[PDB]
């Protein structure tokens, strides 16, 4: 029993990360394949970043330019090309710890983890999760662009993020590994707003069903609710509305505690309502929207990976 | 900036995992050089955990009632040998993924990163502390035996937790690599309690000053205080008495922001007196005690390793 914030194990990913120079800028790269991918303002001086015109850039970068360190190997770029936010570079090295991959774009509220690096060198794993306002909350200093975020199914890695940037707020946001921003930010030293932010409420209640596999369960209540009338109450207390899909995906934990998935909304409307009156839920003063109902499975039930 | 509890990265441990079999019992092991180290009741059945003589049980043990397996590989077990509460099985293969390591045994308020194994494959890794009281709050299930906790020091794993049960509580209890239990604990199924758990306070001054790094600074005040004044509010609130080796310890902290320790003191002292009425630090309601003053400096400063 327990439940903790609980990240993927990181060694197939570990392998993959090098360290990319272009002139006085160095940041991390993924090295999958003879493909070593990064974000492509590694080009730009920081005159360059207020107005980029990233293909005249990268048309004045010669493959030289470029240097690629794997550790103590020195990568020699072949080739070189862009997509959309990401580089490409071509190197005549195959990566033989190359893992099972692919490239995933995931939607808000999935989670996932980090594996923070600097030059090229693993600093730390943690979990966070995509925010509604697609921004993460994560936590990156100066020199952390391009470490990469992924998930794991048994032997395979989806890679799903790479950093590239930090909003004055402290919060963080990048791209996908096709180089595609998630929200609508674009890669330029400009005032950019995020939406609000809100808190996601499918996330609540898979933690509410984790509170109850660990025997935490003062909250329950006899109530019931409709899911109409559930997100009445929530879109005030800027909650996301839960759909119907979302009453699905919590099938499994329903089963295994037998409790309706619309009688815990009825428990966590009166969460809302009433507030927690110093009580704490899995040690927490506040309600914690960043584990996924498969998080939840996969915690309580010990799934492994390859 | 940001901050996020991060565990380390696990790669080098990984490959040291293994599934040991004695009987219908299966857990896992670690495998360091031509030795497999596991918790010794492995050799218990159900009836022999009440009041096991394991010094009798080992002996009516030959080396092949246990199966060893690195994955596919079948070792073979050329010996066996018992340390305190651990199991040492010695093997016909040396472990070529075996990285520079020590053994060492931490004290209580230092932190460690958990991989969580079953079977000798990972599930998860994540961070958390040894309490004053000998236990962890843990994340651990049935087959999670033998699994480990560790620090990394650039290129050095240190060892310094490994499994073995759990109290009815929900909390965690083990060994460190020579076997010898943290706390009071005996690996028999009795009764036996864990003392009382207080707050670690070196830990969360950490946090506070980690909070001031990342511009999170309302409960900053003017007043100031002595170390044996803190000390009475503290003790009143079931935190642990501050020390002078405490105070060294946060100077580096102290350095960076300019905030002497004492101050610090003189802040949380409010803290607790006055509680923190609906506002949070680093996005918690509770103050937290599960970062070290090292972590907090690893973290906000971008230490990697090899
Ligand atoms: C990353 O490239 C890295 O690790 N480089 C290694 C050190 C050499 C680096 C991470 C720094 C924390 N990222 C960046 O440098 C990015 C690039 C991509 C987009 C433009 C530049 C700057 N940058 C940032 O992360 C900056 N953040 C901003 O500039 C915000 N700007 C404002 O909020 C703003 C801008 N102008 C006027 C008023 N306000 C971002 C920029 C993009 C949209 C959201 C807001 C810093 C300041 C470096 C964090
Ligand atoms: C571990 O060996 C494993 O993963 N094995 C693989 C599945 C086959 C296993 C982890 C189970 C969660 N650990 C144990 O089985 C240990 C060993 C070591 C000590 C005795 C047995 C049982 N055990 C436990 O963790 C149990 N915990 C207890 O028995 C507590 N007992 C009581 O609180 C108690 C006992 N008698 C009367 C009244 N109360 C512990 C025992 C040791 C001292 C602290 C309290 C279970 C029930 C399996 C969690």
Redesign the interface.
Same mark, same amino acid.
């Given at each position: #029993?327990?439940?903790?914030?609980?990240?993927?194990? #990181?060694?197939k990913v570990?392998?993959c990360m090098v360290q990319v120079t272009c002139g006085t800028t160095t940041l991390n790269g993924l090295w999958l394949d003879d493909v070593v991918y990064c974000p492509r303002h590694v080009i730009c001086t920081s005159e360059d970043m207020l107005n980029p015109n990233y293909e005249d850039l990268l048309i004045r970068k010669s493959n030289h330019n470029f240097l690629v360190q794997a550790g103590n190997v020195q990568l020699r770029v072949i080739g070189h090309s862009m997509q959309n936010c990401v580089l490409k570079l071509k190197v005549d090295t195959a990566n033989p710890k190359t893992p099972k991959y692919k490239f995933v774009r995931i939607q808000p509220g999935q989670t996932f983890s980090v594996?923070?690096?600097?030059?090229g &060198?693993? &600093?730390? *794993?943690?979990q966070?999760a995509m925010r509604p306002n697609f921004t993460i909350?994560? &936590?990156?200093?100066?020199?952390?662009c391009g470490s990469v975020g992924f998930n794991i199914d048994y032997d395979c890695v989806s890679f799903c993020y790479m950093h590239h940037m930090?909003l004055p707020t =402290? *919060?963080?946001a990048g791209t996908d590994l096709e180089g595609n921003f998630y929200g609508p930010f674009v890669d330029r030293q400009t005032a950019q707003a995020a939406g609000t932010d809100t808190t996601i409420t499918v996330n609540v209640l898979a933690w509410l069903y984790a509170a109850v596999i660990? =025997?935490d369960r003062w909250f329950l209540n006899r109530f019931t609710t409709t899911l109409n009338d559930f997100n009445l109450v929530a879109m005030k207390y800027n909650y996301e509305p839960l759909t119907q899909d979302h009453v699905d995906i919590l099938g499994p934990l329903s089963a295994q505690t037998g409790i309706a998935v619309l009688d815990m909304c009825a428990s966590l409307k009166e969460l809302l309502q009433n507030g927690m009156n110093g009580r704490?839920i899995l =040690? #927490?003063?506040?309600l914690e929207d960043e584990f996924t109902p498969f998080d939840v499975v996969? !915690?309580? &039930?010990? *799934?492994?990976? !390859?």
């Amino acid at each position: #029993s327990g439940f903790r914030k609980m990240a993927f194990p #990181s060694g197939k990913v570990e392998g993959c990360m090098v360290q990319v120079t272009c002139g006085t800028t160095t940041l991390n790269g993924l090295w999958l394949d003879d493909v070593v991918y990064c974000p492509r303002h590694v080009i730009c001086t920081s005159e360059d970043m207020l107005n980029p015109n990233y293909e005249d850039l990268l048309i004045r970068k010669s493959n030289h330019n470029f240097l690629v360190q794997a550790g103590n190997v020195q990568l020699r770029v072949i080739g070189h090309s862009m997509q959309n936010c990401v580089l490409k570079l071509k190197v005549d090295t195959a990566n033989p710890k190359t893992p099972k991959y692919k490239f995933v774009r995931i939607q808000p509220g999935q989670t996932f983890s980090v594996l923070a690096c600097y030059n090229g &060198s693993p &600093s730390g *794993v943690y979990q966070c999760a995509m925010r509604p306002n697609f921004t993460i909350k994560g &936590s990156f200093l100066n020199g952390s662009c391009g470490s990469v975020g992924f998930n794991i199914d048994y032997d395979c890695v989806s890679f799903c993020y790479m950093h590239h940037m930090e909003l004055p707020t =402290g *919060v963080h946001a990048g791209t996908d590994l096709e180089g595609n921003f998630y929200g609508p930010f674009v890669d330029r030293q400009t005032a950019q707003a995020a939406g609000t932010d809100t808190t996601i409420t499918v996330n609540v209640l898979a933690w509410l069903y984790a509170a109850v596999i660990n =025997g935490d369960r003062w909250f329950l209540n006899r109530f019931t609710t409709t899911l109409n009338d559930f997100n009445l109450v929530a879109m005030k207390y800027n909650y996301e509305p839960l759909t119907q899909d979302h009453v699905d995906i919590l099938g499994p934990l329903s089963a295994q505690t037998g409790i309706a998935v619309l009688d815990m909304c009825a428990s966590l409307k009166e969460l809302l309502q009433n507030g927690m009156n110093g009580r704490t839920i899995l =040690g #927490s003063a506040l309600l914690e929207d960043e584990f996924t109902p498969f998080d939840v499975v996969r !915690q309580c &039930s010990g *799934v492994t990976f !390859q």
